[PDB]
C-alpha cells in the first residue's frame, strides 16, 4: 500500500483534471485507505550489489537511493539484474537473467526477438566479462 | 573626510544641540559605506526628519518658514530614502520589507501638498510609486508633470517606464516617441538609451535594441566607473548608477544571444565579469554567467558555476535554487531536484532548511519525506505554528488518517486556541466520513469565537467554519428527501454575508479580491441550485442568479473567467 499511495497521491492532480473525476478519485482513495490502515507488506530485504554499502535495498526499489547506482532492466520478465548472470544481444544490448530465460524457455530476445541461440549469447557475453 | 569632520563636530558638541543637517550627513556617510546596516541610515533619515519638522511646525507658514522648511532639503532626503531601494526591486513592484519607499513616497505627498508646482517632487513621488507597485498612482503623478510641463523629457520617459512595466507597449512606444522629439542631447543620456533598448527588447525589436545598445555601449561606461566615484554634474531624480551599466551590460550581452551572436554576447559578458568584480555584482554578474552559459547550451560550466558560490555568500540559496529549477527541466529528473535542497541541508543545518526542503517535497509530492523534515523542523523550532500547521496538512494529505487525527487531537489539547487547526481537524474528519465527532467539535469553536469581529483574517475563519458546517449539514441528507433544510440556507445566508464583509476588507486594504469574488458567486450559484432542487421558487432563483451575475462582473472577469458565465446561463 505504500507504491498504492504513492500512485494515489500522484493521480489526484497530474496536470488538469475536472471536478468530479478528481472528486471520484479521492472517494476511492478514502475508501481504500479507511477499509484499513496502509500495512507494508513484508519482503526479503537481499544484499545490494551495485554499491560496497551494507544498507540492503527493497527487491522492488531499483532507485537505490543515497547510492546513485541505479539497476539495468530485464526485458525477459522485469525482475532487476541482481547477479551476475546477465547478458545481452548486439541488437538491443538489454540485460538477460539466465533462470528467467530458461523458465520462460525463450528462444528469441524478448524485446527485439534476435533470432540466434542464446547460450552462445551467454558464453560470448561471459567471454566480453572476462577481457573486462 | 566627511567621517573625519562629522566625528570632530561630534566630539567638540559633547553638549551642543542635535541639528538635522548632521544627521542628514551622517545617514548619507552610512549609506557610502557598504558594510553598514541600512536600518542605521534609515533611523538617521528618520531622525533627521522628525527635528526638521519639529523646527518647522512651531510656526505659520509664510516666505520664512517655506525658507525653514526647506523643500529641497526635504527632497534630498527623500532621495536619501529611494536610494536604499534598488533599481531591479524598484520597477518589480516589490517594496523592501522595511518601507523606506512609503516614507520617501509620504514625505513627497507631504511637500506636493504643500507645492503643487514642485515638479521634480512630482518625479520623485511617481517613482516611489512606482517602487511601492502603485503604477497608476505613478501614471497620474507623470500625467501631472505632463501637465504641467509638456516639454519634460523625464516625465515621458518615467511614463515609458510605467507603460512597459504595465505590458502596455503602445502608449509605452508613444510617450517613447515623444521623447525623440523632445531633446536630441538626451539620447546621449546612458539611462534615455538603457530604458529605449530595454523597450525595444520587451516588444520583441531585438535588432532596433541591438542598435540602441551599440549606440549606448559608445557612451562613457568605462568612463563611468571614475564618474561614479567622483559624481560632479548637475543631476536629477535621474541618476546613472554603476548598476544601470551593469543592466546595460548583461542586456546587451542578452539581446546579442536572441540574435545568433554567441561570440559576441561570450566576449562583452566576459568583459562585463571582470568590470564589476569586488561589490555585490560580482555575484551578480557570477549568476547570469551560469544563465547566458545555460543558453548556450553549455551546462557544464554553468553548474560548475552555480556549485562554486562559497557557503558564506547570501546568495548560496538563490544560486542553489535555480540550479535546481534548470535541472528538473531541462535533465527531468527528481532525483538532483531533491538532492539540490537535502544537500543545502546537510551541509549546514538551520532554522529554515527543513522548511523548504519540505516546500520543495511537496512540489514534488513527496509527502512522507516531507512531514519528515517538517518534525525535524519542529524538534528544532518550539513551538513555530507555521510548522504545526504545515505538519497538520502533510500528515492528512499523507493517506494515513489515525495519526494524523491523533497529532490534531494532541495539538487541541495542548492550545485550544487555533481556529486553523480546528478547520484541518473538520475537513479531516469529513474526510473519514465521521459526522458526529465532526459537528460535536465544529459547532462549539465557531459558535465561541465571536469576539474578534474587525479583525479580518478572524473574520475568514469565521467564514470558513460555517461554510464548513453547512457542507457537514448537507452532507448528512438521506437521498429521496424533499424538504428544505432551513438551518442549512441560514448558515449559507451567514456565510455569504461574511463573505461580503470580508471581500470589502480586503478592499480597503488593497488586496486582490477576485478570487473571492469568484469563489462567492460560486457559493451563490451553489446556494441557487440547492434553493431549486426542493422548492421551484422561480422569481427568488431568478433574482439571486442576477445578483450573482451582476455580482461576478467587476474589474477585469470579463475575458479571465468565463466558466462562472458558463454555469449561470446554462442555469
Ligand atoms: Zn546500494
Ligand atoms: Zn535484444
Do not use: W
Not at chain 1, 552462445?120 to 572476462?130: D, G, I, P, Q
Not at chain 2, 553598514?36 to 533619515?45: E, M, S
Not at chain 2, 532639503?73 to 532621495?79: E, V
Amino acid at each position: 500500500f505504500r507504491e498504492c499511495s504513492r500512485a494515489f497521491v500522484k493521480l489526484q492532480n497530474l496536470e488538469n483534471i475536472t471536478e468530479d473525476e478528481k472528486e471520484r478519485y479521492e472517494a476511492i482513495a478514502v475508501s481504500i485507505f479507511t477499509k484499513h490502515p496502509p500495512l507494508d507488506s513484508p519482503c526479503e530485504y537481499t544484499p545490494c550489489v551495485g554499491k560496497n554499502c551494507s544498507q540492503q535495498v527493497s527487491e522492488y526499489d531499483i532507485h537505490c537511493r543515497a547510492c546513485g547506482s541505479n539497476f539495468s532492466p530485464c526485458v525477459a520478465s522485469g525482475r532487476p539484474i541482481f547477479q551476475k548472470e546477465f547478458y545481452q544481444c548486439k541488437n538491443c544490448r538489454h540485460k538477460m537473467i539466465e533462470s528467467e530465460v530458461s523458465r520462460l524457455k525463450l528462444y528469441n530476445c524478448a524485446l527485439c526477438h534476435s533470432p540466434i541461440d542464446f547460450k552462445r549469447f551467454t558464453e560470448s557475453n561471459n567471454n566480453n566479462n572476462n577481457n573486462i | 573626510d566627511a567621517e573625519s569632520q562629522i566625528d570632530f563636530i561630534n566630539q567638540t558638541t559633547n553638549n551642543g544641540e542635535r541639528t538635522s543637517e548632521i544627521a542628514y550627513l551622517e545617514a548619507l556617510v552610512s549609506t557610502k559605506q557598504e558594510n553598514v546596516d541600512p536600518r542605521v541610515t534609515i533611523k538617521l533619515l528618520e531622525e533627521s526628519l522628525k527635528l526638521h519638522i519639529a523646527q518647522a511646525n512651531r510656526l505659520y507658514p509664510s516666505f520664512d518658514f517655506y525658507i525653514v522648511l526647506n523643500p529641497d532639503f526635504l527632497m534630498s532626503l527623500s532621495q536619501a530614502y529611494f536610494f536604499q531601494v534598488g533599481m531591479k526591486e524598484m520597477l518589480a513592484g516589490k517594496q523592501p520589507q522595511n518601507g523606506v519607499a512609503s516614507k520617501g513616497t509620504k514625505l513627497l505627498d507631504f511637500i506636493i501638498k504643500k507645492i503643487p508646482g514642485l515638479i521634480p517632487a512630482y518625479l520623485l513621488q511617481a517613482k516611489g510609486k512606482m517602487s511601492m507597485g502603485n503604477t497608476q498612482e505613478a501614471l497620474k503623478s507623470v500625467t501631472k508633470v505632463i501637465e504641467q510641463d509638456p516639454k519634460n523629457e523625464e516625465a515621458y520617459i518615467l511614463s515609458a517606464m510605467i507603460a512597459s512595466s504595465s505590458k502596455n507597449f503602445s502608449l509605452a512606444q508613444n510617450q517613447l516617441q515623444q521623447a525623440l522629439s523632445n531633446n536630441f542631447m538626451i539620447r546621449d543620456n546612458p539611462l534615455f538609451m538603457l530604458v529605449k533598448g530595454e523597450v525595444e527588447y520587451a516588444q520583441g525589436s531585438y535588432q532596433a535594441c541591438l542598435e540602441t545598445m551599440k549606440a549606448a555601449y559608445e557612451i562613457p561606461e568605462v568612463k563611468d566607473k571614475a564618474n561614479q566615484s567622483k559624481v560632479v554634474s548637475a543631476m536629477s531624480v535621474l541618476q546613472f548608477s554603476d548598476k544601470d551599466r551593469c543592466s546595460i551590460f548583461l542586456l546587451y550581452a542578452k539581446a546579442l544571444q536572441q540574435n545568433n551572436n554567441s561570440k559576441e554576447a561570450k566576449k562583452i559578458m566576459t568583459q562585463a565579469i571582470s568590470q564589476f568584480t569586488g561589490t555585490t555584482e560580482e555575484v551578480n554578474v557570477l549568476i547570469a554567467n551560469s544563465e547566458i552559459a545555460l543558453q548556450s547550451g553549455d551546462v557544464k560550466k554553468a553548474i560548475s558555476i552555480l556549485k562554486g558560490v562559497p557557503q558564506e555568500s547570501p546568495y548560496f540559496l538563490r544560486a542553489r535554487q535555480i540550479l535546481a529549477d534548470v535541472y528538473l527541466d531541462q535533465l527531468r529528473d527528481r532525483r538532483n531536484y531533491a538532492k539540490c535542497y537535502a544537500d543545502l541541508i546537510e551541509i549546514d543545518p538551520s532554522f529554515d532548511n527543513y522548511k523548504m526542503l519540505g516546500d520543495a517535497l511537496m512540489k514534488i509530492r513527496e509527502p512522507e519525506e516531507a512531514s519528515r523534515a517538517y518534525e525535524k523542523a519542529a524538534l528544532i523550532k518550539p513551538d513555530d505554528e507555521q510548522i504545526i500547521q504545515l505538519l497538520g496538512l502533510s500528515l492528512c494529505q499523507t493517506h494515513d488518517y489515525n495519526k494524523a487525527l491523533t497529532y490534531y487531537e494532541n495539538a487541541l489539547r495542548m492550545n485550544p486556541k487555533r481556529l486553523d487547526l480546528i478547520i484541518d481537524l473538520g475537513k479531516l474528519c469529513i474526510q473519514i466520513k465521521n459526522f458526529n465527532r465532526a459537528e460535536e467539535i465544529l459547532k462549539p469553536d465557531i459558535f465561541s469565537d465571536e469576539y474578534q469581529l474587525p479583525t479580518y483574517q478572524n473574520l475568514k475563519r469565521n467564514q470558513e467554519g460555517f461554510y464548513l458546517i453547512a457542507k457537514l449539514n448537507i452532507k448528512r441528507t438521506p437521498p429521496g428527501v424533499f424538504t428544505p433544510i432551513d438551518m442549512y440556507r441560514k448558515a449559507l445566508k451567514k456565510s455569504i454575508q461574511i463573505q461580503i464583509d470580508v471581500i470589502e476588507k480586503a478592499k480597503q486594504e488593497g488586496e486582490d479580491v477576485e478570487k473571492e469574488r469568484k469563489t462567492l458567486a460560486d457559493m451563490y450559484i451553489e446556494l441557487a441550485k440547492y434553493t431549486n432542487q426542493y422548492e421551484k421558487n422561480e422569481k427568488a432563483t431568478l433574482d439571486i442568479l442576477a445578483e450573482a451575475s451582476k455580482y461576478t462582473n467587476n474589474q477585469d472577469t470579463m475575458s479571465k473567467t468565463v466558466g462562472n458565465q458558463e454555469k449561470i446561463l446554462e442555469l
